[PDB]
Amino acid sequence: ARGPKKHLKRLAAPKHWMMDKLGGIFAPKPRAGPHKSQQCLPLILIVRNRLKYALNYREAHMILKQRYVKVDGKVRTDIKFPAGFMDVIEIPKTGDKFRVLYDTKGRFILHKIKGEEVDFKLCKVVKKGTAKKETPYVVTHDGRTLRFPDPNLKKNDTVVIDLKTGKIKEWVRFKVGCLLMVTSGANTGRVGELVNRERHPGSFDIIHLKDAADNKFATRADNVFVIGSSIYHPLVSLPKLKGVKLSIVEDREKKLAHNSKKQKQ
Amino acid sequence: GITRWDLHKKRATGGKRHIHRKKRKFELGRPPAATKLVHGERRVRRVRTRGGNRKWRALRLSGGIFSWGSENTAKHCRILDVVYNATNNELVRTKTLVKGCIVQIDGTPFRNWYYKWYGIRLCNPKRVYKNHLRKTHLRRKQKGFGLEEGLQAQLAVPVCKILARISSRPGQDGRANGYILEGKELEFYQKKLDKKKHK
Amino acid sequence: MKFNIASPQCGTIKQFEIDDEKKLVQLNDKRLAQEFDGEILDDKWKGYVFKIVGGCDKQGFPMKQGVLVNSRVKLLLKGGTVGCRKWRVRSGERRRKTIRGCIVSQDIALLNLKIVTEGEEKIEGLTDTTVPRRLGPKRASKIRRLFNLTKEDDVRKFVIRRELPAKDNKKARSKAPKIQRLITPAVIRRRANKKRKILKKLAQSKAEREAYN
Amino acid sequence: TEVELDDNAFHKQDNIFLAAKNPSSKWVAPGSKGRRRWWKKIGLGFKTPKAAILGTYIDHKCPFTSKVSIRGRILRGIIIRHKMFRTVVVRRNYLHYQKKYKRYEKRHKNWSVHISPAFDFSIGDEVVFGQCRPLSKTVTFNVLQVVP
RNA sequence: GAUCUGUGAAUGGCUCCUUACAUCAGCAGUCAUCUACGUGAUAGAGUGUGCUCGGUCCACCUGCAAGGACCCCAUUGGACAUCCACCAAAACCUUGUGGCUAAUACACGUUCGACCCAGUCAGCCAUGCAACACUCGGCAU
RNA sequence: UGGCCCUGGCCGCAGUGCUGGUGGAUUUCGUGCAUGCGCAUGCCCCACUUGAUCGCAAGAGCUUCUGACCUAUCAGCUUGACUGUGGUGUAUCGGACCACAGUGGCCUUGACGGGUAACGGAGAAUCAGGGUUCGAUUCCGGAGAGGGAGCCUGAGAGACGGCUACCACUACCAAGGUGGGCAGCAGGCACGCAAAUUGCCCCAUGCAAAGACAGUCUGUGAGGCAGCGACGAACAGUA
RNA sequence: CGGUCUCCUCGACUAGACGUCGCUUGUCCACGGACGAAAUGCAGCUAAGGGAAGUCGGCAAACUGGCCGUGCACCUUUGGAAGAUACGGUGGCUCCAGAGGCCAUGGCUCGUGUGGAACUGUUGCUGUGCAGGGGAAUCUGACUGUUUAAUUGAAACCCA
Structure with a gap:
């Protein structure tokens, strides 16, 4: 007897959740929603551990099923919804x-924003296909489909979708010079403009980024995230350190x- | 049950493999359909598969859709008999329908179809429309037209028995669809039939 | 030998005892579910015909119809079948249970019979009393079936009620069932809402494809 | 040599319909005599042999003229021997570093690899072979280049 | 409360007997595959021939090429449960029978959820070389 | 694009209908709004939910490369064995199975066999350096549920707090019959040098379900808390 | 009913000069007949349940038995033991493979010689005659050969 596992031990939990190893044996195992389980925050972690409205699991269930936590312009009552x-x-x-x-340390922060910033979202195209009846679509990293994109919208680009209509409002190409953010690996949470893309056919291409000040780092092309046409026009508000990682000293x-x-004091 | 795993199959060296688990369901096998050619009724048993999906064991099929590739025709044509199989003659003897087996099919369609389409009668039988005359003569005057000497010598006998090859996997989709042999494959299998008629 | 004899037309069931072998032994090839005459095992039951619908035996095992033997046979049985019970078999398991064949013999402790044809006089337990049906039809179409209604007037008036008199501490209760499969203008508006929204969404998608083209 | 096959069946190429009335010049190759042949160009920096493109042999499990896709590892070995039909033994002599004694061992690994009939090779020639789907019990690699 | 239905019981907990490229670790592939819950989109079935042919009502002649009058859309059917009653058995988390009574169970059903276009069938028009081919019509080549 | 034919015959190509569903709300006229003058046009509940498709996500199966202990008083091993063609079967590749062909495949760079003071790894103890020894045990992977084997249901099981059978023990009996599965938690007998309470509870951590909480007790020996506990740790007193 | 020299020697089954039956050749001759034909006997067979308990002693009889495939231990003088022990099959029919020759890749001849498969039968096929039971030790003679015609075949004699 084996099928899909339903539990996640507290030790086996993603470390970027600052789960305390003594505060329970289990951690809330994310559901299979839009985001990956190791690149997501469960709504219980956002509601109980960060924004401490819920003092515990029960009150988190309460808050969430009362249908007033809205994620991407729609209500999500699953206490394990993988917000990413x-x-x-x-x-x-x-x-x-x-x-x-x-953040520059690679953890999920909740950056407080304002009106227009909440009325749209920003999502990266990961796949580009055609469905039946010759329907060109583009699958993004939020798993959504966008069943009729502009023809000149190749894969690694990013998109500005309006969370009300769920259609595409803008999109930004992945060419050299675009402002960019890292979303995995050691350099995650760092913002830097694209400098050059080394090709590796059959394997992972590498992207070299110049930080906001002058640092230089590298990462993977499936590891980068476009935010902005250039370092002058970020398509979204950005946190306190603006993606500039400090030295450890x-x-x-x-x-x-x-x-x-x-x-x- | 029937397991399609290799924990019993010895190592590529020749060394024995000690099994330390028992048979998992995800690596099972099921008994062959051994679809028999049967004049008359079809038997098809649905089979619940790995995701709750269906397979269709064909037991006792009678005919199927057969395509005329050059012609794009695909008529349902009532398989007559298994004539040749690639390797084992036991399936030919017991009339087992397996993919890539060579069969004689009815072929009175593709003959009535050839007439309806081209207005060409292939055997002396043994209102008329202006638009139909026009269209038949147009399809005659098209470019790639012409019936080959191996197909018309078959369509010209009063009891057509045309050579088709079975393309579906009847024990898997419950179908005996196929394609009529054309040109060099026809010559190949006709030569095999000649050889075993004379030897 | 005990006979559970049931009259369905009256709607009742009554047990009887017979120990006279001369009467019993005529029931020795009477395979299950086949009518026979009551005159064979009682003289005050003439013109009655009993269908031998079920049976048990000594040690209590059932009498599975269609087995065609008079001894015990252990069989794999799904739930709900005669011999096994649906609420005991874990959503898809079959159990090997012991059951007797349909051929009757002198190993049968209990025979479940039901009258098909009534007789001249009247049985003191079965036919002297008629038992009313508890409930009336609950779905609209069955209410119509009952009361010869055509779809122009409602069943909401013709629904049968059940009057429980004003017993201790409680007034008279007139209990009625929630009519099922009933179509209300509210239901009609709900279905119209669904269908209209579906069609509007289809139009949205057609317009999207046309604009892309 | 190994272009020869059995005469129990008519070995045809999957994606080429030999009885087409008005076929196109998509598979008419720029060095053939009008013979149509489906082929592909596996694309990890490898070249499709002219023998494959302009040949007559039929080979499923060939990476150039069949549905077999090269994906996964790509290794380099030496042809020990060719005593199976269209299959060939390949050896990889490598050096494994023992940590305690700061030295190396001579180790090796054999591979039943699948040579298509598009490759001229003598025993001892070097080979780069890429991984494909399992073609037999031990064969899961196809020969992508022969180096003399 | 009960019951039918749905869904879960394949997770968790335990143990380390087995197992020596086996398991396992890291790496990689599925262009050789499966998928309940989750999530983002989607969704136009009177439909085996152009028609006769979704169902009835008339026509003509081994059917027709332009011919009609209505009907469907306020939503189906039959069961078995809980219940009552008679109960078999020493028991059994064993079990029979009779009578009601539900559905998001089960069966069954689908017009208006399209429109247009392609295509298929048939007809007609304008104009043009031409006495070649295959024929419909009359005769045993 | 083709997969109906010349009046019966043949197919019947299996399937897919946002439920002939539910709740709450409530004003459903086709012209109510208006435009231009009723005439023509755009509008005239919100959710939940059975099911179908495509992705994604979350998993699984299979597969790749490299890397494991002692043993030669184990040197030759293998015959579906190794490759091929055509099929079968599978969710899928594959000798996985079959039919026909061939004679291969591994091996002193230790094959095959044997041993287990062998579950594997993350890790533990030491450690100047290099290394030595261990890792049943909490996290990950595997295997099992008394030994075997076979299955049904289901998305997922070769499930065992599912079924079926045989074997080994075994419990009840009115002798005809019915049963069993603690390597879950407590607990008992054995075995031993050698290891705890037949406790309370879902308060926390999670999971599941048709399910926020309350009116109106969801379950949970998972898990927590207690008891026993000189295993083993840290800090103090005995002035 | 003993013994006695040589020659020829057919068909079928079969390995066959075994054994069984038949054409050619020859013969029905052995003192007969009745009576189902006692007891006893000499011969042929069977026998439940047990299986050497019978007897000095498994004496006598029984088991096994041909061929094909797989396979075979101790000990050894390395040759053997060995057909060790043992396991499976065997018919009938219908097929599929499979070897050669002559005339000139076709005509004709062409495996009673083998392997596979399907069907078949009240599981039964070396169907009859024929046709090893096997294993483990001690004493003894190495072996093979010889021997008291007419009570002793041996461990005796001979041998190298």
Whole structure:
């Protein structure tokens, strides 16, 4: 007897959720929704652990089934819905409006945003196919289909969809010079413009990115995410560090200075 | 039951493999259909498969859709008899329908069809429409027209027995569809039939 | 030998005992589910015809119809079949149970009979009393079937009620069933809503494809 | 040589209909005598042999003239021997580094690899072979290049 | 409460007997595949021939090439449960029978959910070389 | 694109109908709005849910490459064995199976066999360096459910708190019959040098379901909390 | 009913000069007849259940039995043991393969010689005659050969 497993142990949980190893044996196993299980936040983690409205699992169920947590412009009552990257999470009764993004350390933060920023979303095209009756579609990273895209919208591009209508509002090409964000690997959560794409037919192409200041890093082409035509026009608001990763000595000094100046009072 | 795994099959060296599990269901097999050619009724048993899907064991098929590739015709044509099989003659003897077996089929369609389409009578039988005359003569005057000397010598006997090859897998889709042999494959299998008629 | 004899026309069932072998032994090749005469095992049951619909035996095993033997046979049995019970067999399991064949013999403790033809006089347990049907038809079409209704007037008035008198501490209850398969203007508007929204969505998709072209 | 096959069946190419009335010049090759032949160009930096393109042999399990797709590892070996029909033994002598003793071992691995009839090869020639679907019990690699 | 139906019981928990390229680890492939829950889209079945032919009502002659009058759309059927009653058995998380009574069970049914276009059949028009081919019509080549 | 033929015959190509479904709300006229003057046009409930398709997601199966202990008082091993063609079967590739052909395949770079102080790994103990030894045990993978084997249902099982049979033990009996499966949690007998309570509870962590919470007790020996516990750790007292 | 020299030697089954039956040749001659034909006997057979308990002693009889395929242990003088022990099959019919020759790749001759398959039968086929039971030790003579015609065939004699 074996089928699909239903549980996720607390130790086997994705580390980018700062799950405490002693606070329970199990962690909420994400459902098979839009986002991948290791690139997603369950709505229970967004509601109980980050925005501590729910003091526990029961109150998380309560909050969510009361049908006032809206994710990507529609209500999601599943306590395990896999909210992922670039999703918009609104709580109207509270006036909360977040876009779930990556910090420079590679964790999912909830970046507070405003009106137009909540009324659209930004999603990367991953596949481009044709369905029956000659219907060209483009599957994105949110798993959505977009059943009739512009013909000149090749694969690795990004798209600005309006979460009300669910159609495409804009799209941004993946050519060199575009502003870009990393969504996996060690360099995840870092923003840098595209410099060059090394091709590796049969395997993963590599992308070299120049950070906002002057740093340089590399990652994979299925690991990059386009946000903006250039470093002047980001197609979305961006967090405090604007995707500029600090050195570890810089981060240590920053933490030390913060703790000291806070203890000052 | 019937298992299609290789934990019993010895190593490529020649060394024995010690099994330390028992047969999983995802690697089962089911008994062959051994579809028999049967004059009359069709038997098809549905089979519940790995995802709740259907297979269709054909037991006792009688005919099927046979295509005239050059002609794009595909008539349902009532298989007469298994004549040749690639390797084993036991299936020819017991009239087992398996994919890629060579059969004699009725072929009175593709003859009545040839008439209806081209207005050409292939055997001396043994209102008329202006548009029909026009269209038949047009399809005659088209470019690639012409019946080959191996197909018309078959369509010209009063009891057509045309050589088709079975293309479907009857034990899997419950069908005995196929295609009429044309040109060099026809010559090949006609030569085999000649050889075993004379030897 | 005990006979559970049931009169369906009256709607009742009554047990009887017979221990006279001269009467019993005529039931020794009477295979299950075949009518026979009541005059053979009782003289106050003449003109009655009993269909031998079921049976048990000593040790209590059932009498499975169609087995064509008079001894016990163990068989794989699905649920709900005569011999096994649907609410005991885990959603698809078959159990090997012991059951007697349909051929009657002197190993039968109980015979379940039902009258098909009534007789001259009247049986003191079965036919002297008629038993009313508990419930009336609950679905609209069956109510119509009953009361000769055509679709121009409603069944909501013709629905049968059940009057429980004003017993202790409680007034008279007139219990009626929620009519099923009934079509209300509300239901009609609901289905119209569904169909209209579906057609509007089809039009949306056609317009999308035409605009792309 | 191995172009020869059995005479129990009429070996035809899958995607070429030999009795077409008005066929197109899509598979009329630029060096053939009008003979139509379905072929493909496996695309990991390999060249389709002219023998495959302009040949007459029929071979399923051939990576150039059949549905067999080359995907997965691509290894380099030496043809030990050719004593099966269209299958060939290939050896990879490599060196495995033992950590404790800071030295290397001589190790090897054999492979029943599938040579199409498009390749001229002598025993001992070097071969690059790419992984395909399982073609037999031990054969899961096709020969993509023969190097003299 | 019960019951039928749906869905879960294939996860979890335990143990380490087996197992020596086997298991397993990392890497990779499925262009050789399956998929309930989840999610994003989708969805126009009177439909075996152009018609006779979705069903009835008339026509003509081994059917027709332009011929009609209505009908369908306020939504189907038959069961078996819970229940009542008689109960077999020493029991059994064993079981029979009779009578009602439900459906998102089961069976069954589908017009208006299309429109147009392709295509298929048939007819007609304008104009043109031509006495070649195959024929319909009259005779045993 | 073809897969109806000349009045019966043949097919019947199996399937797919956003339910002949449910709840809440409520004003359903075809012209109500209006435009231009009723005439013509755009509108005139919201959800839930059975099912079909395409992706995605989450899984699984299969497959690739490299990497495991001792043993030669194991040197030759293999005959579906190794390749091929045509089929079968499968969810799918495949000698997985079959029919016909061939004579291959592995091996001192240790094949085949034997041994288990062999489940594997993450890891543990030491460790200047190099290394040595261990890893039943919490996380991942595998296997099993007394030994075997066969199945049904289902998306998923060769399931065992499912069924069927045989074997080994075994329980009830009114002797005709009915049963069993703790390597789940407690607990008992054995075996031993050697290992705990027949506890309470879903409060936390999760999972499942037709299911937020309450009116009106979802379940959960998973899990938690207690009891026993000088295994083993940390901090104090005995002045 | 003993013995006695040589020659010829047909057909079918079969390995056959075995064994069984038949054409050619020869013969019906052995003292007969009745009576179902006692007891006893000499011969042929069977026998339930048991299986050497019979007897000095498995004596006598029984089991096995031909061929094909797979396969075979201790011990050994390396030759054997060995047909070890053992396991499976065997008919009839209808086919499929399979070897050669002559005239000139066709006509004709052409495997009673083999393998496979399907069907078939009250599981039965070396169907009759014929036709090893097997294994494990001790004493003894190495072996093969010889022997008291007419009570002893041996461990005796001979041999290398």
